[PDB]
C-alpha cells in the first residue's frame, strides 16, 4: 500500500532481520525510542536487545564496532543520528571499513551498512543539514547510495543489507514523510549502481539524486509548460554510479544540468560533470552546468536559499537551453 520513506525503510529492516538472524541494528536510541525519526520503531520490541542495541553516543564506537561485528559474523546496520555526525567516526569509516578487504588481500570483509539522515530543507543549520557524500565517494572501498522515494528506500536498503561490500546509506530527512507512495509488501530489491529514469525527455538532461529531487522534478514540470522536455535522472547510487545511464541521456539531449545540495567544490556532481566533459565533449551542445549548495557551511537563516530552489535550477536549464 501507500507509505512514507520512514515506513518503507522500517519495512526493509524488519524484512531483512526476519530473514537473517545475523542482521542487527545498532546506534543511538535505535531501540526503545525507535530512532529520532522512527525508522527503527518497533524493531526492539520484536527482535530483542540482542538484535537492536542502543549504543553509547560515540560515532567512532558505532562505525568501528559495526566493522568488527561484520568481519566476525554479523550483518550490522549501524545508524548515525545525523550525516553531520559521521566525522567523529570518520577514521573508522575510511581507515578501517573502506580499506579492510583491500588491505587484507580479501581475507577479511565488511558486510555492513551505515545509514544516516542528510540534506537540508528542514532548517537544520550547521549539523542537521549536511550532505557529506563526497567524502565517501572520494574514499575507495565504500559504496554510496542516496534514496529519494519510499519505493527505492525499501528496495535499496534491502539490497545494501545483502551486499557484502560496505554501504553508506543516505536518507534525505526532508523526504522522511513528505510523500506516501505505493510500496509492495512483497519481497523485492533494487540494483545498487543503477540510476532511475524519473521522467523521459529529449531537450535537456537533469542529473540529480536525494535531497534536491522535489525541486528538480517541479523544474522539469515548469519546463514542460514551456514545451521543453527535460529528462530527469535520479542516480540513486553515487558509487559506483550509473555511467551508462548518464552518458546515454546526455548523448541524446546534448545538454545537462547537474543538481545537488552538497557544497560545490570537489563535490560528487563535480565528478560526474568532469567525466561527462572528458568522455562526451563531442556530444555536448552546451556546457555542463552545476547547481549545488554554495561553498559555505550550511546556514540556518538562509536555509531556504542555500538548498537549490526551483528558480535556481530553471535559470541553469535556461542557460543550457539558450546556449
Amino acid at each position: 500500500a501507500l507509505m512514507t520513506m520512514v515506513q518503507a525503510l522500517n519495512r526493509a529492516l524488519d524484512e531483512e532481520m526476519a530473514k537473517d538472524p545475523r542482521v542487527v541494528v545498532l546506534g543511538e536510541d535505535v531501540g526503545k525510542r525507535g530512532g529520532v525519526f522512527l525508522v527503527t520503531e518497533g524493531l526492539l520490541q520484536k527482535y530483542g536487545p540482542d538484535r537492536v542495541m542502543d549504543t553509547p553516543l560515540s560515532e567512532a564506537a558505532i562505525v568501528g564496532a559495526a566493522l568488527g561485528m561484520a568481519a566476525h559474523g554479523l550483518r550490522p546496520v549501524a545508524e548515525i543520528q545525523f550525516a553531520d555526525y559521521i566525522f567523529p567516526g570518520f577514521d573508522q569509516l575510511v581507515s578501517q571499513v573502506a580499506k579492510l578487504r583491500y588491505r587484507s588481500g580479501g581475507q577479511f570483509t565488511a558486510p555492513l551498512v551505515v545509514r544516516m539522515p542528510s540534506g537540508g530543507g528542514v532548517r537544520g543549520g550547521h549539523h542537521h543539514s549536511q550532505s557529506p557524500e563526497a567524502h565517501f565517494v572520494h574514499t575507495a572501498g565504500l559504496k554510496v547510495v542516496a534514496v529519494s522515494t519510499p519505493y527505492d528506500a525499501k528496495g535499496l536498503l534491502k539490497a545494501a543489507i545483502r551486499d557484502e561490500d560496505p554501504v553508506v546509506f543516505l536518507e534525505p530527512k526532508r523526504l522522511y514523510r513528505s510523500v506516501k507512495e505505493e510500496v509492495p509488501e512483497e519481497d523485492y530489491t533494487l540494483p545498487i549502481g543503477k540510476a532511475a529514469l524519473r521522467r523521459e525527455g529529449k531537450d535537456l538532461t537533469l542529473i540529480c539524486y536525494g535531497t534536491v529531487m522535489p525541486e528538480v522534478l517541479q523544474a522539469a514540470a515548469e519546463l514542460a509548460k514551456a514545451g521543453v522536455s527535460a529528462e530527469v535522472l535520479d542516480l540513486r547510487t553515487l558509487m559506483p554510479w550509473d555511467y551508462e545511464a548518464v552518458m546515454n541521456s546526455v548523448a541524446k539531449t546534448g545538454r545537462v544540468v547537474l543538481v545537488s545540495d552538497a557544497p560545490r567544490h570537489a563535490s560528487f556532481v563535480s565528478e560526474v560533470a568532469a567525466t561527462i566533459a572528458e568522455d562526451l565533449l563531442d556530444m555536448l551542445l552546451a556546457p555542463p552546468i552545476r547547481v549545488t549548495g554554495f561553498d559555505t557551511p550550511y546556514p540556518y537563516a538562509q536555509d531556504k536559499l542555500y538548498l537549490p530552489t526551483v528558480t535556481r535550477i530553471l535559470n541553469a536549464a535556461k542557460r543550457a537551453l539558450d546556449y
Binding site: 560515540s58 542537521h128 540556518y300
Partner: protein, 331 residues
Amino acid sequence: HRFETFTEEPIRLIGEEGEWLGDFPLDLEGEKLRRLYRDMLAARMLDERYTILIRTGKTSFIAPAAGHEAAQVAIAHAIRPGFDWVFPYYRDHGLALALGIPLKELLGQMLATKADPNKGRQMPEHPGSKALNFFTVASPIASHVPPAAGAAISMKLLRTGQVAVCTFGDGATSEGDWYAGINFAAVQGAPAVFIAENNFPTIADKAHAFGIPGYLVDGMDVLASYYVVKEAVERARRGEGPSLVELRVYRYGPHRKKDPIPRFRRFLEARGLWNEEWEEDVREEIRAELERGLKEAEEAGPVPPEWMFEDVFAEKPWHLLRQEALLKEEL
C-alpha cells in the same frame, strides 16, 4: 580547604531545610547569596519563556534546561565573566544569562534576527559571545572539548591568569574527542575545568584516566556546585592543572522535591534573606526584562540573504563572490 575527590555520594552543602552542611564557614555575603537565587529564577523563567516561543512558532528548537539552574548559575559565579572563558553546549542558555549575555542576543539567536551576534548562522540554542568569552556552541556532542583545552594552554603560555570552563552532558563523555581533549589538558597541566551537567562508574571516576581530581556533586545544590567548581577554578588558576566536576541534576522537561530553586529559597529564608514580597519584586523585574529582550530581538529584523556568504573567510574569495552574484539573480 579541599573537597573530597571521588566520593560515593554527591557532595552537598545545603540541607533540605536550609541548613549548612559545609566543613568550612559560608563566606558568601547576603547580597551575593540573594544574587545567586535571583539568577536561578531568571534562568528558570527564561526557560519557561522558551517553551512559549517554541509553542507559538517563534523558534524552531529549544533544549529545556529547567533543573540545571543551580549548576548553571553556580558556574557563572565561580568564574569572572568577561575574563575567564566558557565553552558551553546547547543546553546552557541559563548559564549564558547568568554570565551577563544580553537577553536580546540570546533571543536574537533563538529567532535568528539581526539581534543575534552570530547572525542566525545556526539553529536555535547556539548562542555565542565575544564580549563574554562564551565560545559559540557547536552542534556536535563533544567537539568543543579539545578547543577548551587549547584555549587553556594559551592562557598558561601567555600568563593571562584566566581559566577555561567546559560544560557538557553525560552523553558527551562517550566521545573520543572528549577523552582526547581532556587528556591533552591534563598532560599540559592546563588551566581548564571540565564540568558535566549530568541529567541523572560515575563520570567523576573517569578523571582517574587522566590523573586529575574528579568530583561528584549535587547539581541541584547551588552552593555545593558553586564551591566545588570555584575550588577547581582556583586550582587551575594557580597552575595545578584541570579537574573533572560532575554536577548531577534532574531535567524536568524533555531532552518536584528536587527543584533547586525551592531548596535554595529555604536556605535564604533561614537567614532572613528571603520573603514573599522580595520574591514577587524580583520576578516582576525579570518578566519585564524578558519582554523587553524579546521585543528588541524581534524588531531587530531578519538577517539579509547575502550574509550567507559573509564570514566563511575574513574576505570573500572569487568563488563566493560569484556565488553571491548568482543568488542575487534570484532575489
